[PDB]
Design a protein around this ligand. Structure first.
Ligand SMILES: [Mg+2]
Ligand SMILES: [Mg+2]
Ligand SMILES: [Mg+2]
Ligand SMILES: [Mg+2]
Ligand SMILES: [Mg+2]
Ligand SMILES: [Mg+2]
Ligand SMILES: [Mg+2]
Ligand SMILES: [Mg+2]
Ligand SMILES: [Mg+2]
Ligand SMILES: [Mg+2]
Ligand SMILES: [Mg+2]
Ligand SMILES: [Mg+2]
Ligand SMILES: [Mg+2]
Ligand SMILES: [Mg+2]
Ligand SMILES: [Mg+2]
Ligand SMILES: [Mg+2]
Ligand SMILES: [Mg+2]
Ligand SMILES: [Mg+2]
Ligand SMILES: [Mg+2]
Ligand SMILES: [Mg+2]
Ligand SMILES: [Mg+2]
Ligand SMILES: [Mg+2]
Ligand SMILES: [Mg+2]
Ligand SMILES: [Mg+2]
Ligand SMILES: [Mg+2]
Ligand SMILES: [Mg+2]
Ligand SMILES: [Mg+2]
Ligand SMILES: [Mg+2]
Ligand SMILES: [Mg+2]
Ligand SMILES: [Mg+2]
Ligand SMILES: [Mg+2]
Ligand SMILES: [Mg+2]
Ligand SMILES: [Mg+2]
Ligand SMILES: [Mg+2]
Ligand SMILES: [Mg+2]
Ligand SMILES: [Mg+2]
Ligand SMILES: [Mg+2]
Ligand SMILES: [Mg+2]
Ligand SMILES: [Mg+2]
Ligand SMILES: [Mg+2]
Ligand SMILES: [Mg+2]
Ligand SMILES: [Mg+2]
Ligand SMILES: [Mg+2]
Ligand SMILES: [Mg+2]
Ligand SMILES: [Mg+2]
Ligand SMILES: [Mg+2]
Ligand SMILES: [Mg+2]
Ligand SMILES: [Mg+2]
Ligand SMILES: [Mg+2]
Ligand SMILES: [Mg+2]
Ligand SMILES: [Mg+2]
Ligand SMILES: [Mg+2]
Ligand SMILES: [Mg+2]
Ligand SMILES: [Mg+2]
Ligand SMILES: [Mg+2]
Ligand SMILES: [Mg+2]
Ligand SMILES: [Mg+2]
Ligand SMILES: [Mg+2]
Ligand SMILES: [Mg+2]
Ligand SMILES: [Mg+2]
Ligand SMILES: [Mg+2]
Ligand SMILES: [Mg+2]
Ligand SMILES: [Mg+2]
Ligand SMILES: [Mg+2]
Ligand SMILES: [Mg+2]
Ligand SMILES: [Mg+2]
Ligand SMILES: [Mg+2]
Ligand SMILES: [Mg+2]
Ligand SMILES: [Mg+2]
Ligand SMILES: [Mg+2]
Ligand SMILES: [Mg+2]
Ligand SMILES: [Mg+2]
Ligand SMILES: [Mg+2]
Ligand SMILES: [Mg+2]
Ligand SMILES: [Mg+2]
Ligand SMILES: [Mg+2]
Ligand SMILES: [Mg+2]
Ligand SMILES: [Mg+2]
Ligand SMILES: [Mg+2]
Ligand SMILES: [Mg+2]
Ligand SMILES: [Mg+2]
Ligand SMILES: [Mg+2]
Ligand SMILES: [Mg+2]
Ligand SMILES: [Mg+2]
Ligand SMILES: [Mg+2]
Ligand SMILES: [Mg+2]
Ligand SMILES: [Mg+2]
Ligand SMILES: [Mg+2]
Ligand SMILES: [Mg+2]
Ligand SMILES: [Mg+2]
Ligand SMILES: [Mg+2]
Ligand SMILES: [Mg+2]
Ligand SMILES: [Mg+2]
Ligand SMILES: [Mg+2]
Ligand SMILES: [Mg+2]
Ligand SMILES: [Mg+2]
Ligand SMILES: [Mg+2]
Ligand SMILES: [Mg+2]
Ligand SMILES: [Mg+2]
Ligand SMILES: [Mg+2]
Ligand SMILES: [Mg+2]
Ligand SMILES: [Mg+2]
Ligand SMILES: [Mg+2]
Ligand SMILES: [Mg+2]
Ligand SMILES: [Mg+2]
Ligand SMILES: [Mg+2]
Ligand SMILES: [Mg+2]
Ligand SMILES: [Mg+2]
Ligand SMILES: [Mg+2]
Ligand SMILES: [Mg+2]
Ligand SMILES: [Mg+2]
Ligand SMILES: [Mg+2]
Ligand SMILES: [Mg+2]
Ligand SMILES: [Mg+2]
Ligand SMILES: [Mg+2]
Ligand SMILES: [Mg+2]
Ligand SMILES: [Mg+2]
Ligand SMILES: [Mg+2]
Ligand SMILES: [Mg+2]
Ligand SMILES: [Mg+2]
Ligand SMILES: [Mg+2]
Ligand SMILES: [Mg+2]
Ligand SMILES: [Mg+2]
Ligand SMILES: [Mg+2]
Ligand SMILES: [Mg+2]
Ligand SMILES: [Mg+2]
Ligand SMILES: [Mg+2]
Ligand SMILES: [Mg+2]
Ligand SMILES: [Mg+2]
Ligand SMILES: [Mg+2]
Ligand SMILES: [Mg+2]
Ligand SMILES: [Mg+2]
Ligand SMILES: [Mg+2]
Ligand SMILES: [Mg+2]
Ligand SMILES: [Mg+2]
Ligand SMILES: [Mg+2]
Ligand SMILES: [Mg+2]
Ligand SMILES: [Mg+2]
Ligand SMILES: [Mg+2]
Ligand SMILES: [Mg+2]
Ligand SMILES: [Mg+2]
Ligand SMILES: [Mg+2]
Ligand SMILES: [Mg+2]
Ligand SMILES: [Mg+2]
Ligand SMILES: [Mg+2]
Ligand SMILES: [Mg+2]
Ligand SMILES: [Mg+2]
Ligand SMILES: [Mg+2]
Ligand SMILES: [Mg+2]
Ligand SMILES: [Mg+2]
Ligand SMILES: [Mg+2]
Ligand SMILES: [Mg+2]
Ligand SMILES: [Mg+2]
Ligand SMILES: [Mg+2]
Ligand SMILES: [Mg+2]
Ligand SMILES: [Mg+2]
Ligand SMILES: [Mg+2]
Ligand SMILES: [Mg+2]
Ligand SMILES: [Mg+2]
Ligand SMILES: [Mg+2]
Ligand SMILES: [Mg+2]
Ligand SMILES: [Mg+2]
Ligand SMILES: [Mg+2]
Ligand SMILES: [Mg+2]
Ligand SMILES: [Mg+2]
Ligand SMILES: [Mg+2]
Ligand SMILES: [Mg+2]
Ligand SMILES: [Mg+2]
Ligand SMILES: [Mg+2]
Ligand SMILES: [Mg+2]
Ligand SMILES: [Mg+2]
Ligand SMILES: [Mg+2]
Ligand SMILES: [Mg+2]
Ligand SMILES: [Mg+2]
Ligand SMILES: [Zn+2]
Lengths: 150, 59, 101, 117, 140, 112
RNA sequence: GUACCGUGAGGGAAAGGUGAAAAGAACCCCGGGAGGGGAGUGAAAUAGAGCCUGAAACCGUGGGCUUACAAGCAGUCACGGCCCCGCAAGGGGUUGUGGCGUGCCUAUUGAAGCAUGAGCCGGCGACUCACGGUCGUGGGCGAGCUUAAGCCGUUGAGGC
RNA sequence: AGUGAGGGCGCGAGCGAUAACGUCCGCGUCCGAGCGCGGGAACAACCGAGACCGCCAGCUAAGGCCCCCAAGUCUGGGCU
RNA sequence: CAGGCGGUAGGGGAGCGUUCCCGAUGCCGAUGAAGGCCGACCCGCGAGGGCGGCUGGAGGUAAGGGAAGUGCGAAUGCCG
């Protein structure tokens, strides 16, 4: 916001030479190489993206921490309903779970658990799978995954 | 005249050194023969107003 | 009795019972090692040429250790050259047991 | 994200003023005069560690000489006789002997004498 | 094993007769004594030299035309203040100085050297007043 | 046991007061009163007020007896300076510092 | 967009923080007041309003060592003395004498330089980012590799 | 990448006055960047020698060995 | 085992520390966070990192990675 005036003459002042007080050398002056808005995004090879997504499910397969279910029985919408069902699938919540399913109601039920991460099938991504101990998927969602890759 | 000027800041040592003589002397004092109050010698006592036995001025 | 011995490329006058710090040896602490004698003084006076044949000083290694840190610093002017090195010289502590010879 | 100077520059500065304790006037109070002084100090040490060695050899030599001339011969030939007679006792020890063990030094004198003529 | 360092020690007074000795070659030794470097426990940062008493200094000897030609100077701080004195004249007036001066310039400069210089006791003529310390007559 | 008094933000320059304070340090309360009575300085006034305020605190607050009081400790510390503009020739302006002091007196008993 | 500066157009600051709660210190004491000393409040007043933390330059008070025949980039190596911490041996502080000793930066063929810059301290202070190139490199696919805008989805999900 | 002000000394030439801490080339060297260490009183470039760090150990170099100041007031033989 | 390790411009390599992000709905924290002040202690070649005493009073941020307004002593610098 400062003026452009040379605050005092170039010579014979006995002071040091200066220009505007917007010079980065002044307090309150401008910034030399400060940040300006930016796009940190870039276009990672589609083949890579897929290949790692398959590769993520693989890591979880080998560990054994992948479980396919054809449907979640008791869950009509409420969290306690999921907690009931989860108990039976042996999801005692001693480890983190990515829950991938198209079922609107089921994601609603598991959602507020602090050990569960909800996801649509279209939303499968390799970050979310890695940062969770367990993978659990609809057969109806497994279909989507198998389809993505290939 | 071409404006003489200190070539170097004076050191704390050298500053205080100069002031080795700046110290004050305690007032010299004597007791009044009359009221025995302290006072400077050769002056008329401010406490009782006496000097040389006589009452000089009234306190 | 005293002995002039030689270890770690330096020479020292010892008596039995002398605590001596010397250049680092291989002995396990508690091991006893023999040191070459260059001269025997006191009652006898035996003078090595350079080493006294039969003699030896039996010493026991108390332990090893690093000396205090000598901070070695270098600085050349008008040339932007500085270096800091932290030297801790290793050693060996010996108790002088006896003087054979 | 802005990474302001913060604590760092003080910590560097305090670190060095710590070293410069004892120094005279600003050399112990000003960081910039502390540093400068320290530069010197470091170099004096390095060079003086080397000198310390020479200095003691000189001291020892001066003493061994004094002790020598009591027996009527200079350090010059004493060392020589001590060499040609295969003695390896160094000067740090020669000098300690010259003082603490006269009778032994005195012997080493006779040996040196013997083995040069 | 550290170098021996002597504890404070009784001095050793000594007597020199300067008659006939060569000025320079005498003082070279008086300095040696003064400094202490004949004692095998010698130590450079302490005064442990001898006390030297010298007599008949007025009868020191010099080679060459040094009597007339050697010239002792000293400044005065004032302009034209340089005084120059031939040896002849100094011997004539303060013969003690000649040796005094010769030895001084052979002692270390600084505090210790100035202290060692005080242990020199030079007199012209055969008599010295330090009968009290009974100085051991030296020969060289 | 000791009794303290502090006059602070006193509008006088420390070097000047400190000159007076040095007169009474270590002195008895009676010499001190006498000394300040006749010390030809402006600071005498202020040091005196503190010295008297201490003596009061000594007896009225701390059970100490007036006949045994002495100036055990005393000092002057620089307070924040009133800065002031002094115009000089040719347009120049200077800053005058009108300085201030924190005068502290500490009295003890002693029975010798 | 104020104070202030400027005829004017115009220029253009500095200044945030007691405490959970004002419970913001009645009353006594010294004092003309200011300010303090008791008291009282609070977990804390070394949170007392000039109020969180409270570094450094700078200024004092007290103590240890030291200094008035020694001349010095202020240090360093050694020895010795005193004071202190230590069972011991060891160490901290200080410095008497001895040894050695031409600040830092920059600019330079060359600087202790009588060439430059710096009173001192604290904080701000200089090789970035975008797009396009050229090499190297970690990977993906390979006679192929790859999408752009945009559309769908999400609302730190990706796909098309 | 940086460099494209070099400098001193020895030697060979030009210029100069068979002047210059002069100037310009050529061969070498060192300083530059080794103002780190020993010597030459002091002294970039002369003599010695290329400093990773430690040692209260040893040998040498140049230069030295009467005192300041480490080592011969060494030994023959001359001269001044 | 053998050899190398002076160094300005400059090239290369390996690290230390600052702010922020993931790790985190976690773990440390009034039995005391950050910051401050000491230290003759420990680790590190060093930049540093710990431990102990005092202060302070509400925050902090692991291993492993990511991103930069990232390190000051000099600009007759700027502000105080
Ligand atoms: Mg504006
Ligand atoms: Mg314009
Ligand atoms: Mg301005
Ligand atoms: Mg200007
Ligand atoms: Mg001016
Ligand atoms: Mg100017
Ligand atoms: Mg200026
Ligand atoms: Mg400017
Ligand atoms: Mg501003
Ligand atoms: Mg940017
Ligand atoms: Mg961008
Ligand atoms: Mg691209
Ligand atoms: Mg897109
Ligand atoms: Mg839903
Ligand atoms: Mg959740
Ligand atoms: Mg989680
Ligand atoms: Mg969801
Ligand atoms: Mg989610
Ligand atoms: Mg998610
Ligand atoms: Mg002072
Ligand atoms: Mg006076
Ligand atoms: Mg009377
Ligand atoms: Mg009166
Ligand atoms: Mg014995
Ligand atoms: Mg030991
Ligand atoms: Mg055996
Ligand atoms: Mg140790
Ligand atoms: Mg240690
Ligand atoms: Mg150099
Ligand atoms: Mg190193
Ligand atoms: Mg910065
Ligand atoms: Mg000191
Ligand atoms: Mg060394
Ligand atoms: Mg030497
Ligand atoms: Mg050597
Ligand atoms: Mg022979
Ligand atoms: Mg003696
Ligand atoms: Mg005798
Ligand atoms: Mg006669
Ligand atoms: Mg005249
Ligand atoms: Mg003249
Ligand atoms: Mg005369
Ligand atoms: Mg001299
Ligand atoms: Mg005398
Ligand atoms: Mg006589
Ligand atoms: Mg006589
Ligand atoms: Mg007489
Ligand atoms: Mg006697
Ligand atoms: Mg005083
Ligand atoms: Mg009175
Ligand atoms: Mg005026
Ligand atoms: Mg002014
Ligand atoms: Mg002023
Ligand atoms: Mg204005
Ligand atoms: Mg409030
Ligand atoms: Mg509040
Ligand atoms: Mg009150
Ligand atoms: Mg009143
Ligand atoms: Mg009034
Ligand atoms: Mg209270
Ligand atoms: Mg209270
Ligand atoms: Mg509390
Ligand atoms: Mg408190
Ligand atoms: Mg208020
Ligand atoms: Mg309020
Ligand atoms: Mg206020
Ligand atoms: Mg007020
Ligand atoms: Mg304040
Ligand atoms: Mg404060
Ligand atoms: Mg006291
Ligand atoms: Mg004091
Ligand atoms: Mg004197
Ligand atoms: Mg010294
Ligand atoms: Mg001593
Ligand atoms: Mg004492
Ligand atoms: Mg004491
Ligand atoms: Mg202590
Ligand atoms: Mg203890
Ligand atoms: Mg003890
Ligand atoms: Mg001790
Ligand atoms: Mg000590
Ligand atoms: Mg000193
Ligand atoms: Mg000491
Ligand atoms: Mg000296
Ligand atoms: Mg020079
Ligand atoms: Mg500069
Ligand atoms: Mg020069
Ligand atoms: Mg200058
Ligand atoms: Mg000049
Ligand atoms: Mg000039
Ligand atoms: Mg210029
Ligand atoms: Mg400046
Ligand atoms: Mg400045
Ligand atoms: Mg200037
Ligand atoms: Mg100024
Ligand atoms: Mg920057
Ligand atoms: Mg660049
Ligand atoms: Mg770049
Ligand atoms: Mg940058
Ligand atoms: Mg690019
Ligand atoms: Mg190419
Ligand atoms: Mg590439
Ligand atoms: Mg490829
Ligand atoms: Mg594009
Ligand atoms: Mg939506
Ligand atoms: Mg959308
Ligand atoms: Mg978001
Ligand atoms: Mg969000
Ligand atoms: Mg998209
Ligand atoms: Mg180029
Ligand atoms: Mg090129
Ligand atoms: Mg060009
Ligand atoms: Mg040039
Ligand atoms: Mg060249
Ligand atoms: Mg050349
Ligand atoms: Mg020449
Ligand atoms: Mg020539
Ligand atoms: Mg010619
Ligand atoms: Mg000619
Ligand atoms: Mg010629
Ligand atoms: Mg000529
Ligand atoms: Mg001519
Ligand atoms: Mg020429
Ligand atoms: Mg020529
Ligand atoms: Mg050449
Ligand atoms: Mg050189
Ligand atoms: Mg070279
Ligand atoms: Mg230089
Ligand atoms: Mg040299
Ligand atoms: Mg030299
Ligand atoms: Mg010369
Ligand atoms: Mg020079
Ligand atoms: Mg030259
Ligand atoms: Mg030189
Ligand atoms: Mg050079
Ligand atoms: Mg030479
Ligand atoms: Mg030659
Ligand atoms: Mg050899
Ligand atoms: Mg040799
Ligand atoms: Mg040769
Ligand atoms: Mg030779
Ligand atoms: Mg000579
Ligand atoms: Mg010498
Ligand atoms: Mg000698
Ligand atoms: Mg590293
Ligand atoms: Mg988090
Ligand atoms: Mg958190
Ligand atoms: Mg939460
Ligand atoms: Mg954790
Ligand atoms: Mg609490
Ligand atoms: Mg705890
Ligand atoms: Mg605490
Ligand atoms: Mg402190
Ligand atoms: Mg500790
Ligand atoms: Mg260490
Ligand atoms: Mg860490
Ligand atoms: Mg650690
Ligand atoms: Mg606390
Ligand atoms: Mg803390
Ligand atoms: Mg709070
Ligand atoms: Mg982290
Ligand atoms: Mg943690
Ligand atoms: Mg990490
Ligand atoms: Mg990390
Ligand atoms: Mg990561
Ligand atoms: Mg990190
Ligand atoms: Mg910045
Ligand atoms: Mg700077
Ligand atoms: Mg500046
Ligand atoms: Mg200026
Ligand atoms: Mg300013
Ligand atoms: Mg200014
Ligand atoms: Mg400010
Ligand atoms: Mg300023
Ligand atoms: Zn009266």
């Amino acid at each position: 916001a400062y003026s452009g005036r040379k605050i005092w003459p170039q010579k014979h002042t006995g002071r040091a030479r200066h220009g505007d007080i917007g010079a980065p050398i002044f307090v309150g002056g401008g910034v030399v190489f400060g940040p300006k808005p930016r796009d940190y995004s870039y276009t990672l090879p589609k083949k890579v993206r897929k290949k790692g997504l398959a590769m993520a499910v693989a890591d979880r397969a080998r560990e054994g921490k992948l479980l396919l279910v054809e449907a979640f029985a008791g869950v009509n919408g409420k969290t306690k309903e999921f907690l009931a069902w989860a108990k039976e699938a042996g999801l005692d919540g001693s480890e983190s779970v990515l829950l991938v399913t198209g079922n609107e109601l089921v994601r609603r039920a598991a959602r507020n658990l602090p050990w569960v991460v909800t996801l649509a099938p279209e939303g499968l991504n390799v970050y979310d799978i890695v940062r969770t101990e367990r993978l659990v998927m609809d057969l109806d969602a497994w279909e989507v995954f198998q389809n993505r890759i290939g | 005249a071409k404006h003489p000027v200190p070539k170097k800041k004076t050191s704390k040592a050298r500053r205080d050194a100069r002031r080795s003589h700046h110290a004050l002397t305690p007032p010299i004092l004597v007791p009044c023969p009359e009221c025995k109050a302290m006072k400077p010698p050769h002056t008329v006592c401010p406490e009782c107003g006496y000097y040389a036995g006589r009452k000089v001025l009234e306190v | 009795m005293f002995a002039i011995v030689k270890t770690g490329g330096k020479q020292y006058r010892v008596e039995p019972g002398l605590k001596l710090r010397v250049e680092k040896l291989d002995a396990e602490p508690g091991a006893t090692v023999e040191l070459p004698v260059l001269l025997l003084g006191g009652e006898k006076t035996v003078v090595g040429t350079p080493v006294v044949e039969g003699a030896s000083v039996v010493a026991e290694v108390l332990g090893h250790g690093r000396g205090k840190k000598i901070l070695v610093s270098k600085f050349k002017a008008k040339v932007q050259y500085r270096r800091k090195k932290g030297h801790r010289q290793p050693y060996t502590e010996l108790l002088i047991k006896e003087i054979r010879g | 994200p802005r990474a302001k100077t913060g604590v760092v520059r003080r910590r560097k500065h305090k670190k060095i003023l710590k070293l410069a304790k004892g120094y005279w006037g600003l050399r112990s109070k000003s960081f910039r005069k502390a540093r400068e002084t320290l530069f010197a100090a470091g170099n004096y040490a390095y060079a003086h560690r080397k000198r310390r060695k020479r200095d003691f050899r000189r001291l020892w030599i001066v003493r061994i000489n004094a002790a020598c001339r009591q027996h009527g011969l200079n350090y010059s030939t004493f060392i020589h006789g001590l060499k040609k007679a295969g003695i390896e006792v160094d000067r740090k020890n020669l000098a300690d002997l010259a003082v603490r063990e006269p009778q032994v030094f005195a012997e080493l004198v006779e040996r040196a004498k013997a083995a040069q003529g | 094993m550290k170098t021996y360092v002597p504890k404070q020690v009784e001095p050793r007074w000594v007597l020199i007769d300067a008659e006939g000795k060569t000025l320079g070659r005498l003082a070279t030794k008086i300095a040696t004594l003064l400094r202490g470097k004949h004692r095998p426990d010698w130590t450079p940062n302490v005064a442990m030299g001898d006390f030297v008493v010298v007599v008949n200094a007025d009868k020191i000897r010099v080679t060459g035309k040094k009597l007339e030609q050697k010239i002792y100077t000293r400044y005065s701080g004032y302009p034209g203040g340089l005084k120059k004195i031939p040896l002849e004249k100094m011997l004539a007036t303060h013969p003690e100085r000649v040796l005094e001066h010769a030895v001084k310039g052979m002692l270390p400069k600084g505090p210790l050297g100035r202290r060692l210089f005080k242990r020199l006791k030079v007199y012209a003529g055969p008599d010295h007043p330090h009968q009290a310390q009974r100085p051991e007559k030296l020969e060289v | 046991m000791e009794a303290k008094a502090i006059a602070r933000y006193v509008r006088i320059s420390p070097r000047k007061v400190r000159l007076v304070v040095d007169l009474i340090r270590g002195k008895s309360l009676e010499e001190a009163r006498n000394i300040l009575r006749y010390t030809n300085k402006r600071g005498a006034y202020f040091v005196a007020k503190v010295l008297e305020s201490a003596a009061a605190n000594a007896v009225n607050n701390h059970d100490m007896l007036e006949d045994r009081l002495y100036v055990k400790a005393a000092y002057v510390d620089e307070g924040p300076a009133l800065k002031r503009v002094l115009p000089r020739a040719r347009g120049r302006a200077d800053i005058i510092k009108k300085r201030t002091s924190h005068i502290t007196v500490i009295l003890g008993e002693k029975h010798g």
